[PDB]
Structures are given as C-alpha cells and as structure tokens.
C-alpha cells in the first residue's frame, strides 16, 4: 500500500525509458522499409505509436506516484486517463482489424484515422467519469459513479464483447484451417508413399488394384492443394501421376500382377521430380504462415492478459483491495514494454530488418 507507492515510480520510469526507446525503433523501421510494410504491420505500427504516446504520458504518472498525491490540475488527470483509455481501445480495435484482415486473407491512411477516431468515442466515458477526490486524507484521481452508466455499458459491450468473440472465432478458424491444411498435405503424401510400398511388396493383384485406388484418390486430392509457370509445373506433374496410376490400374484389371508392379515403379520418378519438390514448397509456406500467426497470437494474448485485470478492477471499484490495485496498475502499464520485445524474439520481419539498420 504505502510501501507499494515507493517501488512503482522506479518501475514506471524504467517502463518509460524502455517503452519509449522500444517503439521508436519499430517506427523508424517503418520509415526505412516502406516497401515491405503490411496491413498487419501498419496496424502494429499504429499500436507502436500509441505505445510511445503512452510513453510520453508515463513520467506524469511517475511524478504523481513519487509525490504520493496528485499535484497537477484535473485537466491533466483526465488527459492522462483518456490517453490510457485511447491506448487500450486503439490496441483492441487494431487487433480486431488484424483479425479481420487475416481471416479475409487466409480463409478467402483512411483506415488508420477510423480506428484512431473510433477510440476517442469509447474513451469519452473516461473523460467524464474521472475526477480528483480528496478523501481519507488523500487527494487521488480515481473514477467514481443513470444515462452515463447506460452509455458506459453500451460502449463497453459494443467495444469489448463483440471484438473478443470476433477474435476467438477468427483466430481459432485460422489455426484450425492451417493445421487441417498441413494434416491433409501430410496425409496425401503418406498415402502416396505407404501404398507405393504396399504395391512393391504385394503378390496378388487384389491388393495391387486396391492400393492404386487409394493412390488415385490421394493424388486427386493433392492436385487440389496448389496461370503461373510454377502453377503449370504443379498440376501437369499430377496429370502425369494420375495418368500413370491409370496405366497400372488398367494393367491390374487384366490380371497381370508383375506388369502392374513394374508400371507402378515408374511412379517413383514422377514422385521424386514433380511431387516431392512442390511438397516441400507447399509445406514450407504453411510453416511460415503458422509462424506469422503465432506472433499475432502472442501479441493478442499479451495485450489481454495484461490489460483486462486493470480494466476490471477500475470498473468494479468505481461502480462500488489496496494490494490488487497497484498490482493491476503495473501489469497494464507493463504492456508498453512487452510489444517490441515480442517483435525481437519471434518477430522475424522486425529482427532481420533491425539488424540491417545496425549495419547501415
């Protein structure tokens, strides 16, 4: 409580200098490599500029916690709380835009002003609910509070519950789609190899004809995986493959086991030349798209697991415990530093590009 007031201006200042420096390097990477910027990137860069705006607002909180009481005016306090609320709402709705963009990209300026502009609307409840109360010998600036409560509840529902269910639907759909695509790809490849071994070790034409049936159904499925020259090299390599299965099913229908096994030995040449080369090409593209989603998943999970308890504490307390207030306050203020940390560990686009900045 009173002891906890002593450690947080050291922690918030350390949050301030690392959080300021962490996100300018992101936004100076955004100005040096504008050719490779992306939708997600732009939304992530807007989250970074909201983070350095919060980094500028942090030293006011540092002095206000170091003095033990609020020194500046009420305009400053509701400016600080509105800046924190616009940071939270900007992060939530930019992750909403990222989720929508990645859903419409995988399953299937003028944006940035809208997401920033819409965040002022939901943070307008913070501008009127917060006032400096001089109670119990302490002049502290905390929110306290029928139409205003209805406006707060409607804005809370519309800005939080719809994007959270929208995220937990969309990102699970992305993960399930990517994992089932990899599972279908590997199942088709394992069918094509295992039934080839079955044909090679077979003795009677009943299992040769039955294994080619399973090979033809998997080679027809793997052709649907995929006007480019690489597009013509993929599908024509499967038209040879299914066309060579039909040359062995026709031989196995005549009752020739040894001629069917020799004709299915030529399926190894097409599998090595046309199939295995684009098996690894399609596999490595799926592992890259999984790794990009795993960065976005870690960004969403860090943002909610840090900012949701402080938002629930301030909503419960103002509607109606000393240790949980300062723990939740430093947890949501810690998020300003955790965002460029995640871009430096698993953030492959940021890490390789920032290393080129140090060379230049």
């Amino acid at each position, epitope marked *: 409580r009173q002891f906890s007031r002593a450690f947080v201006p050291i922690a918030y200042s350390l949050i301030c200098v690392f959080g300021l420096l962490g996100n300018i390097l992101v936004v100076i990477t955004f100005a040096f490599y504008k050719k490779a910027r992306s939708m997600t990137d732009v939304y992530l860069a807007n989250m970074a500029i909201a983070d350095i705006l919060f980094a500028l607002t942090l030293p006011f909180w540092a002095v206000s916690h170091a003095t033990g009481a609020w020194v500046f005016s009420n305009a400053t306090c509701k400016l600080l709380k509105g800046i924190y609320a616009i940071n939270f709402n900007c992060g939530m709705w930019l992750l909403t835009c990222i989720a929508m963009d990645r859903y419409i990209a995988i399953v299937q300026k003028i944006i940035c002003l809208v997401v920033w502009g819409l965040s002022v609307i939901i943070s307008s409840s913070t501008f009127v609910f917060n006032q400096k109360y001089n109670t119990q010998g302490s002049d502290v600036c905390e929110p306290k509070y029928r139409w205003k409560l209805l406006m707060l509840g409607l804005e809370l529902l519309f800005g939080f519950f719809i994007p959270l269910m929208f995220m937990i639907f969309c990102y699970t759909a992305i993960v399930k789609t990517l994992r089932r695509q990899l599972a279908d790809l590997e199942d088709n490849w394992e069918t094509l190899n295992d039934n080839l071994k079955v044909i090679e070790k077979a003795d009677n034409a009943a299992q040769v004809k*039955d294994a080619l*049936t*399973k090979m*033809r*159904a*998997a080679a*027809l*499925d793997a052709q*649907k995986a995929t006007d480019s020259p690489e597009m013509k090299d993929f599908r024509h390599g499967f*038209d040879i493959l*299914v*066309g060579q299965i*039909d040359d062995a*099913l*026709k031989l196995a*229908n005549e009752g020739k086991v040894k001629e069917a096994q020799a004709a299915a030995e030529q399926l190894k040449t097409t599998r090595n030349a046309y199939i295995q080369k684009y098996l690894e090409r399609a596999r490595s593209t799926l592992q890259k798209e999984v790794k990009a989603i795993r960065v976005i998943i870690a960004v969403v999970l860090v943002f909610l697991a840090c900012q949701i308890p402080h938002n629930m504490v301030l909503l419960v307390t103002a509607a109606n415990i000393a240790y949980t207030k300062t723990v939740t306050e430093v947890l949501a203020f810690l998020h300003c530093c955790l965002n460029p940390v995640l871009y430096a560990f698993i953030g492959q686009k940021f890490r390789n590009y920032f290393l080129k900045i140090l060379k230049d």
Partner: antibody
Amino acid sequence: EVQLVESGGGLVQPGGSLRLSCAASGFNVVDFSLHWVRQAPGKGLEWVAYISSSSGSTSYADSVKGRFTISADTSKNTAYLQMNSLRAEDTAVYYCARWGYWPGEPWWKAFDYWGQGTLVTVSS
Amino acid sequence: DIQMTQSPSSLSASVGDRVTITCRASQSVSSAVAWYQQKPGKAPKLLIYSASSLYSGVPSRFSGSRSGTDFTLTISSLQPEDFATYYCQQYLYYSLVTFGQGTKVEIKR
C-alpha cells in the same frame, strides 16, 4: 447436337444371346470411352461394362464378367454389347453413356450425355 | 468395392421447399462424385459433376457440396419439374463407378 442412340433390345429366351448397338453421332468414339449402364425394372442404376476405343482397354462388372463382351467400331461410330447366357436377372433397360479422357474437364463430366436405352427381357 | 450410401430413400416436399439429399462413400473418392436426375420413363440427366460444379444447361437451383466423404445435393427452390429420382455416383476410375440407391422426391400432401 451430338447424341447416342441404342438398338438391338428385345425379347430372348434364357440362355440366349443378344447384341445391342449404340450409334454415336456428332462425336467420335476415339475421343470418349463408352459405358453400358443397366437399370432393372423398379430398381436403381448398375454399371455393366465400359470400352476404351483408343487404348483398347475394357472392363466388366462382377455379375456380367465372362458372359458379356463389349466391342467398338470407329468406322460406323458404334459400340456393341454382346450378351450371352442371359440369366433371369438380366431383364432391364440398357443405357449407353459417354465419358471423356484424363486429363482435364472431359474426365470430370462423368456420363454427361446418355442414350435412351433399350429393354432386354428374358423369359421362357 | 466402393459403396455409395444415399441416405434418404424417399422424400416428400412441396413447391418452394429447400431439400437436401446426402450420400456417403465407403473410401475416399476425392471430389469425383456426380449427381443425376431421372424422370420416369427416360434416361438420367447429369446435374452436378465434380461434387460442386453444376452442369451447363441445368438451372442454378441445384448445388453440391463435399465434407470429407459426405456429399450433398441441395435444391434451394422446388418446382413441379424438380420431382424425380436422384442418384449419387462415384467415378474414381473407369471400372470402379458405383451409383447410389436413389431418392424419389414426391409431392407433400
């Protein structure tokens, strides 16, 4: 338009023989495999046999293997289903359908154009 | 050795209904499934090929879908002409084609 007609259906004794026809007009048999499909009176469709005029490859169902023999004649653009040892379960309507060749979209349109079928009835 | 199991053996519906006929393959047959319509006393007509693509000539109220080895023919709006028998067929190879049992669509009364 292109079409397939059928002929040779009729009434025979059990154990007899009958050669059906399927005159294809408007397209060539060297572009399409010709199939014979069977529908018993009151029952569903059942595949019998097919013929690949180009590669000469042919196949039959289990119930018609050995007794049935299908040939092609590209000079007259016809197909023949010679049926011998006609048991009592072979009285049906016979349809002659066409099917394209791998690769491409002609293979994916399975039995796009049919014939009107002929009734083959076996009874003593 | 690949069996198609057309589940509704008979169907009764009125004009304007949306009906769904389901078929199930014994093995995987990729998307090589066709849907045919036969009126009584006439040859079958191809409606759906490659399990989703409606044939050039049939109306657009017919649609097809694939979920694993479960294939579905959907008629969005019934019509007097719609009533007929419908067959699901797998065509994985020339010598392995098999039809479904059939589904007679009748008039609800």
